[model samples]
Target chain A: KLSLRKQRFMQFSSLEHDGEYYMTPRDFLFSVMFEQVERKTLVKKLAKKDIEDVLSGIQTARCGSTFFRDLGDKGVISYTEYLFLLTILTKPHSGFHVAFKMLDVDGNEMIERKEFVKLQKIISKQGVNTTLQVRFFGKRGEKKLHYKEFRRFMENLQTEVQEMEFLQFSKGLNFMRKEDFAEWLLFFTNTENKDIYWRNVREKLSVGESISLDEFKSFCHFTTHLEDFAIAMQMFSLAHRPVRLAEFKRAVKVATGQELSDNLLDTVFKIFDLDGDECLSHGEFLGVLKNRMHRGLWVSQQQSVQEYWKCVKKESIKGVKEAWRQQA
Target chain B: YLGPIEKLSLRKQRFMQFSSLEHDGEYYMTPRDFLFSVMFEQVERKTLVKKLAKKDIEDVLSGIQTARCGSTFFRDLGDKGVISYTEYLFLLTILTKPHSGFHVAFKMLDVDGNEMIERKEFVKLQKIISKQPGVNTTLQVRFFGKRGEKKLHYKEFRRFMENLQTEVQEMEFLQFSKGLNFMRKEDFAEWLLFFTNTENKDIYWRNVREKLSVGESISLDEFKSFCHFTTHLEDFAIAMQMFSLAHRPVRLAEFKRAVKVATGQELSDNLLDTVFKIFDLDGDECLSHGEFLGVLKNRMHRGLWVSQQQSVQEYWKCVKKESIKGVKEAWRQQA
Candidate 1:
């Protein structure tokens, strides 16, 4: 049965470029994620450091002949492979069911006390985020959790932590949606420049009829903060179409107090670098952010982003039963 | 009532205290003020809603600062319209004052329209209330068995209230009877004295006889039977206690002396024919030792009587009534 994320993700058809099949950085990232990045030079090109394990754990030695062809090996690095590496560095882990499956070694659907303690030790040893703590881990009875209990814990963690982050970040407005986010961004820009930030969204951001959920997540990742959003806009308008990674870093450095981690930097390029080019474009970058803003604005009217995911819990289960019936 | 309150010095107030200052402007006071004040506070509309029904509470709460409601509440206390200050005191008296409340509680239990509370009536009241929603009527009605259905007059009411207040915990059945378990008129009379507090004894017994007899006059047969019970076979047994070491058959003169010694009373000559007819059991003309015992044998053995406890008790009622001929003769002679 398809997960809600996987089910929702497949609802879109491939985009066409000049009568040829085209994959956006988002689609391209998911396509080759099952393969491991063993190409040493392609690995370094994607700058897989902090998120190396996640990208490499996809599957066995699939050579990177897609995404970027900078390797000394005669492998033709495709934009697909390069974007795959970049997606991992940027996106948050999608679901805890997937994470719990990786941890539930006994296949009993129950994480006993020993297993729970063991898993927490591994996560802490891996220096993962300490957000997953004992309070969220413990069960009410039998001192162990069924899969359903763990799922609820994972959901609460997402809603609780993300909302806390969202509240702190968007403290200025009552929580800005796309237009308001763009409004805040434009407001930030007008204080500095004349025509630097693109004001109209439908004309500039989207080529499709309207922005989608994927576009909304991209908007959140890139321009969620005002200071960072303005800096990202400046990075977009630095040169012509696709700004080189090194040049993007230089602009980000001047805006922020610290250097951009190559892991996050590689992710930014893959998200904005839509044309299969190794560099990013001003139009490409602003276009995605606007689409994202438009989506965030669109989704806010229907339900909160948290509520949207909570609804997914029911939808995905229904999808599983539907699939089973279809098979039967 | 106002005339006496006028006599009390404002400062020399015994029953009541007041906020008003002195002189010809002196405020007349009575404990009625305190009683009214207490009941008024308790019957306030706002708090009264917790105990009373919703509609009842609503009527009170909706009143003009309980002007109407207090009038109605006072009415439920057995009065009409706005009560006098004394009326308020009277209502609270039966509630807060234990002595006053006994009579009031007695009146409440007088469900049969009789002024007195019979044991059955009182027990019936307890049974009904014990099943009610809030009363927790768990007390055994038998605890008051000394008068059990005899009469619950004000003094008995006071005892009832005292026991309720103290929540008498043990069997609390103070033994009221010795050997005789059956109800006799003298036995009842003795119990009446033992049961009721001294001030209310006569009222309690009169109430018991009146209620139990239900206004029916007893017959002559019942009168004789009651006299037999009045002086128990035990009295005959006691009569034998005066027997001579002169175990010989006694002459009537000697028998009269023995009777005097036995009872500490003179046997009138007019009663001898009746005594001889009743006690000369062997038709021997004299009361032999065996005849004396046999005299009471008939009264002591219940099968010998034409009636049992009920007849004897009713017979006592006939004797008590003014229909007895000698009583009227004495009344006429007094003129």
Candidate 2:
């Protein structure tokens, strides 16, 4: 049986379609991804055009496709589909594993050409161009795709999507102006205080330097492990130490095991170093990145999830006890 | 310095682990399960097994159970003698770190956000504390007037909470002290177990005892440092783990590096030596990560660090993937 929390979330997300509970593309966006309390407040105030902008943006990503043909026909997601999409959004690697397991129908621990094609079709429907490599399938495309190759494919697909997103902001330029980079960063973050944060970031965009696609990608990778980086920064701050280029590089290395290039680090410092002292302000750098990392969904939704769970649990207990009394 | 998101996420993950007992499609923790899972009962059990009487430990558990059931917020859940995941998280937070609850209780009673709670509002805290093992309402008279006309500010409210916690700590310590000014190292080790929720208490104590000085007794100040160390244990453990990956057989320089990395604070060589002297089990002059962490586990009597190593990603990989498999299997069955 699903836990009460999971059941409640499903119930809230699902809508009746042809005597079956399903979530449409709109429902997926409105009730799942953007259902967070803060995001909900921000969404509530948006004009029709703004709302449609978000809806269409999500629709273009093809985020609501179901593997089951019946569900896919209606462009709606069933319970399992909802689960898959949720996993894909929150845990991409796990989602890849799930997709692989689902496609490997024979339980042979390997996916054949037919299975690979099916996987590619599903991924393509989800708006990712799964450009198959000839070498992956061997001569005449007769070989089976192992898990390792599949993982590499997924990783490359993610990189391609991210590159596409970067180019959208870059507008075909080899580099993104700092203000455009800020907008790209904010696109992932879900916050009502975006305007204020944007203003703060924009004020610091006076460096006249532009972030290259590679530097942007490197920084994105750095922010992916922002929690550990945040802890490292906290530790540094506790030591009454300033975060200069050297400290920043060491912290990133310690936290994420990635050695960011001097060029990327320099680009970061140029944008974030508020006082021209080559040191990052803890609040501005961490706060902006924190929002970007989890997309501002965690902080607001965490309290709400706790409170909602408490409310539902209390109500469910009351109802259960009432049912027990009636049976007695 | 952990963000609210990370903090709450860690807390919820812990709740998910503990509320293992299922009831009507929900996970709940029975009083016994809650006590043991949290290591509150384990602390008493260890003490009883070592030197204290079983009935004494049993009585303490009963008092905790009674107090939990009688709590106004948990009264509904009390009838079932179980706490839901959220309820468990709430209790865990308040019980382990009462200071966090202090703000909530203060804001709740403040009524107007004026930072002051009147006599009527102050009595609620009195009622809340009365339900626990040690009932001391005399502080109410001190904070408010004898006629209950005085108001209690946030500072005074905090003092009262701290005093209450101190009283609880003193009471627990005295039980193990057995009328002595200081506890023997062995007794201190067992007493320390009361704070941790780790398993294999005897083995843990054995490792810890090996590192500690023989025939040395623990003073209240020393015990307090142990508890304070626990509050920083997670950060320190992460620091050591990270440093160990880069360097091994942690020496004074490495230890200093770990500390600096973990807390961002530099320590004197003297202070570093003192830590080494206490935890360096053999004369090898290197901190054994196993024994060090094992002893550190005692400070985890509150069980807050039990889920420290269990990251959210790991949970998703295990629990969420398992769910996905279940869904697939169910679909296969239908197909």
Candidate 3:
């Protein structure tokens, strides 16, 4: 997956700076789940063997050129994942088994996690940078599954996602498709090594802010903050970075006083208080400012806190507008 | 004449009375449910359930505004008649209040409709709107005058409400169950059975540091069976804790082998069979312990699957219960 910086997501980190390198490959998962599960405060006890197996099997070097070049699948992966999430979260039935069949094309009774993984490897191997298929026949009280039609729907989903970012993502589970796909990839790749990923994408900033249109989905999924999404889409539309990372940094740095870091930037793309706690919503974000450590000092020094407040409002508004636009 | 089972069938009738929900009974809502109904005399026009009297619309207003009634004026306006989807807003605007729900519900209603107002004489409308009881002591302030109150189309509001509730509840119920792994499996977070026993110690060590792919169920079962015969126990918490002990799930064979190696007593079906039997629980067709005991046995042995340091858990409840004297010694050592 492309680096995180190009994505312009609200990742909260300190390592990424002016010149750095890294890789992020967080596909095959949901950012909402990732945020709730994977993060700094909690360390996952991944088996050393499993880590080796996943990394060794990963075709990272082959990934750079054509593996994810088209479908223009930056957020393209996000669209597929968004569809997967929709399939699971919005299925017609409550049965987990039925959902598995719908996503599993082999008519196998189970969706051995490795099955989707195998398809992922194949797509990567084929130099197919396009959106691959995710076909599953559901029984009725079932969904009418037309393979080609569903494929087209996925295509249209990515295309609508291509339109602009969306703000609907802020209200929980509502996500922008292609934008969501981009968010998905960033999260997937960053699970292991984030700094290196951002480093590479930043280097490629001159190419475009997004690796492809699919990147918008990553921007959408990376955080619940609609504002981060706007900065991301604006960067993509302007072709500001050419190498999505640069565009992301340019937009986010202007929006947030904090420099763009893979970790710090991710906060914008996650669900606010997703655990029914901890994640901050709009009211909570405002609370951070109200409880700012430097507010008193600024006011005492006679440098009007008002000026700082103005900057805060302006930048946040820019972030908010971009997020709102993405939601729309 | 309808019995309980027959009344439960009202769901289908209710759907038919409205728009036929199309997706099985889950409701896709066909045009036919709307086109025909037993209650509609004309048979052409749909007679959706409505606020027939003032109280009808009042209920809708109460439902919508109740969530955001912090302000005094809106709270005191207390009993209200539904005005428009903007009913809350029209009340707040005419009644002079600032409850946020007043506008939010109204806008949603307005977006779904085009009605502006009730053309009836203002005084007659006031009479209906003011009929509501001033019962809520929580609301102390009050507004006076004819323009202070206005009547709403009770039937229209009820119809909209019926629709709104169905949509919200339907979506919310599905969301409630999607991502909760903790809700099931009771024996997930139990205390170690003994702090000093080598058998218990090794179990903790392997669980936290070692990886078993299968014997998790079996090992837990033996520990559970022993606890039950000796102590009469349930081990849900311990079971949950056992899962977190390993970096990965234990293989059934490896788990059983470890138990036999540690205990020096081969389980009824070697460690391999023990794990398969325990996890398969009631479904496992073969077993001397029988399915019920097998399930209970594993449930008790939860934390022992493969832990890194059961010896360190002197503070654990099972340890404290097994020997209060040991619990005292352990506490003194820490002290």
Candidate 4:
């Protein structure tokens, strides 16, 4: 009965796979599988002996999202929960599947000797920067490199996991103030920072050494991509976000003669007029070549003025739009 | 409420699995006691159905259909609806499984399909569900997609039917019921669909993908097997739609094929070039379905509209790939 479902059915039509219905985890598990899975690739010919180096990468590739912010607010997750999340996001299965194929002498899904060499070759391209952490980490042996773990991990990390998990994660977020986040940022950076070592960072920041080891788990979740706190440990800093509606509004207002315009669609057809005609503009297909430049949702407000062009062959609209609308 | 003695009894957790607050609002018996009674009856009825099914196939389908519909079908769909051909077949799917249970003994052996699938045959998994005790007949299996062609598989199909015929036993059901904490694996699927039945669509779809987005943007080649398409157009749409500013993390091939489905075309370099122009704003190698929908949602929120049917079509062919550099700049609403 929620608006999201009805709106989708009304909008997507046949793409709306079922009768009008809202989203929920307890019931819906969209049973989709990846399309053409290329499963096995060799890692190396075999490294007879390699140094057992100990290093850890932050658990995320991107941080400071509203999803994490909501969790921090609820206190359902904890610092260790964060750290455990890191293990889930990374280490164990690298959170999601990232592997390159090579010759495998051993069929056991493990990196064979030749595959390791091949892996090194692939790593060399990324500037010889990679690790064999999966071969060494504590809980790494359990979940093999597969999709489910990474899938569930992110699903759980999102704002929509069950209420209990969300609230519990939020409670854990408040336990780590901004200062704690800054200090942990330093720790997880894998940067020693000499005089400002882990111990000093902990002591100087008043890390509350006995701050209930039980509650410290979730802090580990935020370190993957960047190391800045938005506030109260729930969101990313303004500087880090992909879209900021307020900023979008400020830029558009001077050009549009108002703080904002609620009727954006009409304005799109009116002011921009990227297409030449009338009748509210037909599909302004910007075609393939211009799509990537024009289609990003978070693009600038001024450019949307160009109007969605026409691709007579494809009969599509241009793909670009502003990063966000000032919905409020 | 019952006294202390029953609190620590053998089936303590079982009593909690189904008895929600609603059960107590009307019933004289407490929810725990009442559910236990229902499950007990379910157990007997399920056991009898399974034993009887071994005798003959048609008899089982008919009897189980009767049990499943329970005159409700007579009322809801009526004799006209329930007793038809395709629908009569489908009733085996909806009415057969436990209303709120695992009821393993009823259907574990009743399922007619082989467990193992061919390494390459991808789309047929959804069709061959096991027969439910109360519902009549096994479901007709189909691999639903362009490549798989909704092809009805028969070789592996009959084997499952044979397996179900031989596998169901009272002991097996007891094991599944007890092992799964009285709820069956079938219950998991049923409950998921039911519970999700009333939730938010966008939020639900996002959450579902987020579940799959555990890792980084997965490679397209390795992950394509998991993605089967009914058309190159929907496939194309699926792929182009996979990209998102918000953690666009589906397998690459899944994205590619989604485009294929959407465009109803092949994935040639020409198509790729065409898609590249249509989808990406920054010229990055990806496009997220959510971000794509964001644009659609924004435009549609207005009364001013155009050829949406044309809009989606051209979205696939002409502007599939575009540079994303200025994309973040495209729809700045206010500034």
Task: Kindly list the interface RMSD, in angstroms, of each predicted candidate in the order they appear.
Answer: 51.2, 19.4, 24.0, 25.8
lDDT of 1 by residue, B1-335 (tens): 10111111111221233211111322222222232333122222322112334343223213223222221322232211122223223323333333334232344445453666764454333322221011111011222332243565555545544443222111111112232333333333342233122263443345445433432222223333333332443433433432332244655665555444334354454343334333343435566545445433432321111321243345346545744677678888896
lDDT of 3 by residue, B159-266 (tens): 433433233222222222233322111122122222123333343334323333432322334433333222221122222223223333434544443333333345
Instruction: Give lDDT tens digits, candidate 4, residues A124-218.
Output: 22111122223212224332332343355356543232233323324454443433433322321223232333333444333342222222332
What lDDT does each candidate get? 0.35, 0.51, 0.31, 0.28
Q: Estimate, for each residue in B154-264, the C-alpha lDDT of model 4 and write its tens digit.
A: 434444333322222222233334543243223211222321223344543443343322322222321121111211222233333223212445444545544444444
Off by over 4 Å in 2: A1-86, A92-107, A111-146, A188-203, A206-208, A261-263, A270-287, A294-328, B1-335
Which residue window of length 10 is worst by lDDT in model 4 chain B? B1-10
Clashes of 1: 14
Question: Backbone clashes per model, in order?
Answer: 14, 5, 126, 180
Q: Estimate, for each residue in B113-200, the C-alpha lDDT of model 2 and write its tens digit.
A: 5788886664454333222121112233445655568787888656544554454455445656785878676676566555554465
RMSD of 3: 31.0
Worst 10-residue stretch by lDDT in candidate 2 chain B? B68-77
CAPRI quality band, candidate 2: incorrect
TM-score of chain B of 4: 0.17
> What is the C-alpha lDDT profile of model 1 across A1-328, one tens digit per residue?
7532233233321333223233332333323221222331112222224223322322332222221111112222122222222222223243333334434556567665445534432222111211122223322323456777655544443333333333333553343344333443333122332233333332234332222333323334444332344433442443223467775665455434344456445544544454546666545455444433332112232234346445654675687579779977
How well is each residue in A161-226 modelled by candidate 3, as lDDT tens digits?
A: 323323323223343333333343343332333443344344323332222333343332223233
DockQ of 2: 0.02
Q: Across all candidates, what is each one's fraction of true contacts kept?
A: 0.00, 0.00, 0.00, 0.00
For candidate 4, give the DockQ: 0.01
Task: Identify the superior model by TM-score, candidate 1 or candidate 4.
Answer: 4
Name the top TM-score candidate: 2
